[PDB]
Each structure stands twice: as C-alpha cells, then as structure tokens.
Nucleic acid binder design. Structure first.
Ligand SMILES: [Zn+2]
Ligand SMILES: [Zn+2]
Ligand SMILES: [Zn+2]
Ligand SMILES: [Zn+2]
Lengths: 198, 197, 197, 198
DNA sequence: CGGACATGTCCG
DNA sequence: CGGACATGTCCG
DNA sequence: CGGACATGTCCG
DNA sequence: CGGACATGTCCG
C-alpha cells in the first residue's frame, strides 16, 4: 500500500481552475463532463481535452502533472495501474510505459514518472501559455484501461489530480475531477446524474 | 482491562442512534433488531449507523466506536480479530489488521489502541447532516464473525458509540449488540422468535 | 498453428461422451445442452464428462482433452488463459497456470505443451468403469470465462476429447462446445430459445 | 507447493499392515475406524491408537514415521499444517512444535521433523517389538486441529501415511488411512458409511 | 436462485 | 440524448 | 435467496 | 448407535 496525495482544491497564487467542454449524453460520446458530479465520462484511449484555465501567467519552467488515485478510501492506498492485459498489448507510443493509466497525447516533452517512494505513476508536461486566440491551454489526456478492467481498476472509481508545479516538484495549483473510462460515456453520465435525485 | 461504561447517555444534543430497516431475508448484508437492539451483519459488509442529534454540536466534534464483550465474565478481555483474520492481509492500508471495527468512506478515519486498556477503537470527525438529511450516516465494517475461533469465539459483543469533543470528553453515548454471521436475516428471525413463550 | 481435426470418430470401442443432465437453473455449476452439444459451466467448477465405450479398451490407454477455437478465422490461434488469470497464482501445484483445461481428482494427470503446435492439452490414464457403473467419469475445470479479455475474448471453443493408446495413436475422438460463464443455466436457456423461429 | 509422497501400500519384507479397534458410532466417540472407508474419525487431541501389525521382527534401529497429506490432488501439493489459532494456543507438550498436526502421546524418544526440501511435518518414534502378551505394538497419535479448522485444514480431507524405515530414512513398509478430526466422530462415520450406498 | 442492474458489444 | 442484447455482479 | 446440509456445542 | 440447536457453506 502507498500513502495518499491531497486532492483538495488549491487555486493558488495564479488562480488555477479547470475547464471541460459541453458534450451531451449521446450514449456514444468520445468524452463528456458532468458539472453536477465533477466527473469525466470518457472512453478507452480516446482524447480527453482538459482546459488549463488561469488568472495570471506562471514562471516559465513550470510543469503540469496528472496522477490517478482510487476515490474510495478503502482503495486510496492502492496504486492505480493498468490491467495485466492492456499492460501487455503493445499499445505504447514509444513514450508511455505500458503500465501507465494516463497518457498525454501529441507532445514531445512528456515525462512519465514512477514515484520513488509511493510507486505511483504520473505524466508531466511543461506549462505553455494560452493560445494566440484563446484564454487557456488545453491538454490532451488519454485513459488507457476501462474502469472495469479485470485485474486493473476492477470497476473501482478514480480521481485524476492535476497539479501545477515549479521545476522542483513544488506545488503552485491543484485541481481534481472524478473519472470513468467506459464503453458508453453518454449512457453512464445520464444514469449517474439521474441517480442524483434520491 | 478496566471496562468502559456502556450506560446510554443521550446528552446535551439529544444524541441517539438510528439504523436501516432492512428486513430479515436470510443473507441480508446488515439488519437491525429494534426488539433486541441488535445489529446482525455480515463479515466486512457495510453497516450504516445513523447519528441523530437535536441541536448541531460544536466544531471538532468526534465519533467513536469500540466493542466490548457483553457477558460480564468476559467484559475485561479486549475484543480483537482472530488469528486467522489478523493474518489474511485484508487491511485497506488504513486499518490495523487486528481491529475488528472499521470505518469506510472516510479519509479522516483514525484508529486507536489505548495505552492503558489496550482496547481498540475507531473515530471520525462528526459532520452535520447532508442536504436535507435528518442524520449523519457512518458506515462501519466488522471484520470477524461473532463465531471466529480464537477471536470472539461466539461471545456476544456490544458496540459503544461515543460523541466526544476535540479533547476526549463525553458529549453523548449509545450502544447496541452486534452479531456478525453468515445469515443476518435468518439469525434475526430465530432470535426474535425465541423472545416469545 | 496447424489445427487438429475435430471430426468425431467413435472408433473400435464405440466411444461416445455422456454428460450430466443438470437442468437450466441460472447458476447451475455445469450443464450440458444436447440440442447444441454444448456444455455451459462456471469458472473452475467441476465439469463431469462421462466416457462411454462398447468394449473395454486395452491397458495403458490414455484420455486427452484440448480446446480449439470453433470459428475457422480463429482456429489456428492457441487457446490460452488470459493474462489476469495466468497470474493469479490459482495453480493446484499440478497444472501450469496458462492451461485452460484442468483435471481434478486424478494424481496421474499429465499436462502437455506441444513442441510443434504449442497447444495445451491434458491427459489421464483411462480406467474401466467403477463398481456397476456404465462409464468412467472425468472431472474437468475451465479456468477462464469464454468472455476473458485477452484470453478467449468471447470466442466460442470446442473441447476435443481423444481416446489414445500408450503411444499417441487415435482410438477414438469426440468433441463439444464449451461456454464458461457466470450463469450456465441462464445462458443455456437463452441460446436454446434462440434456436426457435 | 511441495512434491507429494507415495501413499501406496507396501507390505514389505516384514508384512506391514495396520490395525484399528472396534469402536461403534456413538455420535460422542473419542476415536472410531471405518473398515469400509479406510478412515479414522477421531477428535481433537484425543488418543488415536494405531496397531503396528507385523509378520516378522525389523532390525533394532528401525524408526516409525507419520505424515499427513491432503487427500484430494488439488491440495496434495500443499503442506498440511495447523491453523493460526491452534498454532498459537500454547498447547505444546514441550516436545511437539506448535505448528505440527500429528503428535505421538506418551513416548520420550519422539522426533518431530520438518522436511528439508518439501517443508512437510512428521513425527517419528523408534520401533519396539510387540508386547509381553500381544502380537502388535500400539502407537498413541493425537490430531491437533479439526479438519474444519479455519486457515488450517479448512474442511479438506487428509491421509496419514505411516512408514517403516531403517535409520537412514530408507523404506521398509508403508500404509495409509484417511483421517477426519471432528467434533462427533460417531455421527460422521455413520453419515459417510450411509452415503456409500449411492 | 431473482431482481435488478452494470457495463461491454453489435445492431438497424 | 438509441436500441437491443451479451454477460458479469450484488443485494436480499 | 432455499434447500440441504456440514459440522461445532450444549442439552436433558 | 442421542437430540436439539448454532452457525457456516454449496448447489441450483
Ligand atoms: Zn485494461
Ligand atoms: Zn475472524
Ligand atoms: Zn481469464
Ligand atoms: Zn485448528
């Protein structure tokens, strides 16, 4: 078992929030967000765009971490990792280690880290200020197993914790949302929102 | 070990316990007998205990659970998991493997071994009731059957729930009997049938 | 891999298979469909296959079981356990953990990986039927569901049972389809209902 | 897992057989044998007298081993040993290690052995010729857990294998019987014999 | 075992 | 925010 | 979940 | 070869 990171929202000196796109609940959707649930319902290995929203610009050098943990406290001390099967299916892009649940899509400066003590996985990319014509940076994350994967997540819910750091692994912003990698992100969102009444 | 009191003490905040009304189907996960004031539940399944209070108590208020043997011949013995279950590495990473009572769903859960009495207990910060709820629910697990050989060994037990401040002082006390067993509903029915002449 | 034949060959000894007639209750451990010639059984539960013979065959006669994929698109792929189950260390100490088919109850059980085809199979010495029995029973286990991801992956399979001498030569061949699944009875019923127009 | 010893009957140069006493099926019995089943139904830690029957006398020096194995082939490779609880209940007679299922009662020259490779337990006592007025030696064995012990035998059936050896651990005779340590050796015997018709 | 559904897949 | 099924799971 | 019972304990 | 119950388990 391994110790657990904070999930608490720390907006920080620079006003760190998160943005997700209007997506609907078409049983089929690649990726959809529940503002009510604070949870992404996305599909296996399909692009999950995350909006890095800010008040004011971080020091050049700043890195951006992602790390999944189990949500329930009875699994929080267990490392989130890929099922034996996907771990072995040769789906590496030549960057991401085959065991890592979270990948960053389309960026050469991506680092994948296995924590020295806790043994937890994460992926970091350098910060890069918003667009020419846009008020936030967007990262492209992929989830590499379904939440249901046998011998992996095993139908147990996770959080993604996105952290803003300087280049020493020191905190500057923190935010977090629930995640479900599933077949029909559309149908499951409705069913879980619809369950909120109770 | 010196036996902590169990004398129900509703207190300043009119604190009583509530439980789910879940019927007596054989293999119901958890079921409570009002007639017996006794929960019948399954090994390591979820056992909701409701906290009912009259007036919301102060901040930094804590909620404690401890088992004691109910018979007075066994009252001073520390209630513990059996040696089989203590060694089956079924810890969640948060509970000590010897502790019979667990709380799930709470990251602020704290486990205690008394330096004086050696008695296991488990505490969580008290929280005011949810959006429109009338009470706060706490989900406990019992990690050995009442029948565990070398553990409880068929001896009934009580769960003593204490409302306390940040300091350690009693604000409130309640208790109920527990049976942890394979068929909570079957057993509730038998023991209630056996009230009748 | 070169696909072994499955062409039923009753042989000199009038060897056919029999199976228990166990009904279609949802969670029946093992059940056989005559209409489908298909066993529906649960992961690692006991699956009696009866050997019926006309005239008792010679000594040192052996009995082999092997899985192949039934669809011809998948026929050459070696049937294997999935990566999860291969690594759950559920071996009995006698079976290799990658082998889907096991025999229980037999100390003379032998497991084989072909040096040519790489295909797993399992063999036991043939024994004449018991005290007044009409057949010899062999108890097999299937150690992955048909649905195992990275294993069978929802692809139906056949079990090829071969009667052979001490040497390796075919004396007898039969086969049936297997589904390993959580509800053998439910699934038998659905698939048979689906025969009808 | 550990390799499995032979159980096959080897009567040997000296005609090695076993004898058990007429005992009946009084639901209560300390110890009773089923000739039909070749199986002892006895109770936890109660005296199980085993008859060492012979044709002709073994070389002074000869030892007598007992070792339990599981009966079913799916457990035969697992070492038979005591449940965590009895293992810990301080019931040692100052000779038998707390982990050993089988003890020899009333004999000072008893050795308890943990096998060097397989890790299996056994207890050996020197051979001693029959009585002044008796045609066989009788050993007093005790079973130290019920077959049902949680984390021990776990309701799984065992064999006892009694071997005759010289003093180098070399074979001279072998015999074996099924065992059940239980609460009511009486009732269970009937029920298992009664099941033989089926 | 049912009921109810959790959750993947393919259908038209 | 598709529908219909394929196939595992949990609770009573 | 029932049915049926496996298997320990105490009863009169 | 006692009887009656206390309490876990497996199969359908
Ligand atoms: Zn996976
Ligand atoms: Zn226990
Ligand atoms: Zn599998
Ligand atoms: Zn024991």
């Amino acid at each position: 078992s391994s110790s657990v990171p904070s999930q608490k929202t720390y907006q920080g000196s620079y006003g760190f929030r998160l943005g997700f796109l209007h997506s609907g609940t078409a049983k089929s959707v690649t990726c959809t967000y529940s503002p009510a649930l604070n949870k992404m319902f996305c599909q296996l290995a399909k692009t999950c765009p995350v909006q890095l929203w800010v008040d004011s610009t971080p020091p050049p050098g700043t890195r951006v971490r992602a790390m999944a943990i189990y949500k329930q406290s009875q699994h929080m001390t267990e490392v989130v990792r890929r099922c034996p099967h996907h771990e072995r299916c040769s789906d590496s892009d030549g960057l991401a280690p085959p065991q890592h649940l979270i990948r960053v899509e389309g960026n050469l400066r991506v680092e994948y880290l296995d924590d020295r003590n806790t043994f937890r996985h994460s992926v970091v990319v350098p910060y890069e200020p918003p667009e020419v014509g846009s008020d936030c940076t967007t990262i492209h994350y992929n989830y590499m197993c379904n939440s249901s994967c046998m011998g992996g997540m095993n139908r147990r819910p996770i959080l993604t914790i996105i952290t803003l750091e300087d280049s020493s692994g020191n905190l500057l912003g923190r935010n977090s949302f629930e995640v479900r990698v599933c077949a029909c992100p559309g149908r499951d969102r409705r069913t879980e929102e619809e369950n909120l009444r109770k």
